[PDB]
Design an enzyme around this catalytic site. Sequence first.
Site, mmCIF file in Angstrom:
data_model
loop_
_atom_site.group_PDB
_atom_site.id
_atom_site.type_symbol
_atom_site.label_atom_id
_atom_site.label_comp_id
_atom_site.label_asym_id
_atom_site.label_seq_id
_atom_site.Cartn_x
_atom_site.Cartn_y
_atom_site.Cartn_z
ATOM 1 N N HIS A 1 0.923 -1.006 -0.146
ATOM 2 C CA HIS A 1 0.027 -0.045 -0.011
ATOM 3 C C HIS A 1 0.853 1.194 0.051
ATOM 4 C CE1 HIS A 1 -2.632 3.005 2.069
ATOM 5 N NE2 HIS A 1 -3.303 2.789 1.165
ATOM 6 N N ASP B 1 -6.044 2.288 -1.913
ATOM 7 C CA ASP B 1 -6.767 2.153 -0.421
ATOM 8 C C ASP B 1 -7.637 1.016 -0.514
ATOM 9 O OD1 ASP B 1 -5.401 4.417 0.137
ATOM 10 O OD2 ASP B 1 -7.085 5.812 0.186
#
Lengths: 122, 122
Positions: A47, A89
Amino acid sequence: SLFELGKMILQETGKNPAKSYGVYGCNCGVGGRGKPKDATDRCCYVHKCCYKKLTGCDPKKDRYSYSWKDKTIVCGENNSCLKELCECDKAVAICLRENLDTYNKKYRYNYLKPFCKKADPC
Amino acid sequence: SLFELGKMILQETGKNPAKSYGVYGCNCGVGGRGKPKDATDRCCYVHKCCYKKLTGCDPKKDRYSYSWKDKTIVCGENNSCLKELCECDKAVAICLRENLDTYNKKYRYNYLKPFCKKADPC
């Protein structure tokens, strides 16, 4: 932004994002990257790597539209950067959820992120 | 280092440092400073400013000696910066401890530290 990210993680994992992933391992939550301690942590690694690649928008503060449709994070067609941001996300929320099975509370409250083995470059 | 700091916080507050102060408010845990949400948060605020005045050592990683003597953090002499570092850490542990009474669990898990109002200059 972290608003959407937090919500996504919540929507996917059913967990409080900051509680379960705010200081988890070497990658989850603020701090930067470190050698992932487990699959959950690597979600966050990936991420953050996803964030790194982003130009043209602020991963932390830029808002974007997504919706929760049929229990799926569906990023709005925002703009290129925000879409990527949203997808970063979404990916981590999904990833975190997918790896809830190995989620290790031992890694949950890592006050020692800077001592994580250095992360490979993204 | 966060070893000593965490330990100090634990010894003073009795609290798991990463759990209770890893992501608390705008100032506790990693991230930088923001407008303190409360007195606990302000401890971390002061702490992070205290860190800012350090030079010659890495507040995150540089280990130093301190002892827990008569339930008091006693910073070892170490060297100037590590001593000053230790004193920073001691101060925040004490401060965190002193402000347990208004420690608010609603600030404990702040996934939104970037949205905190900007801190005043240190």
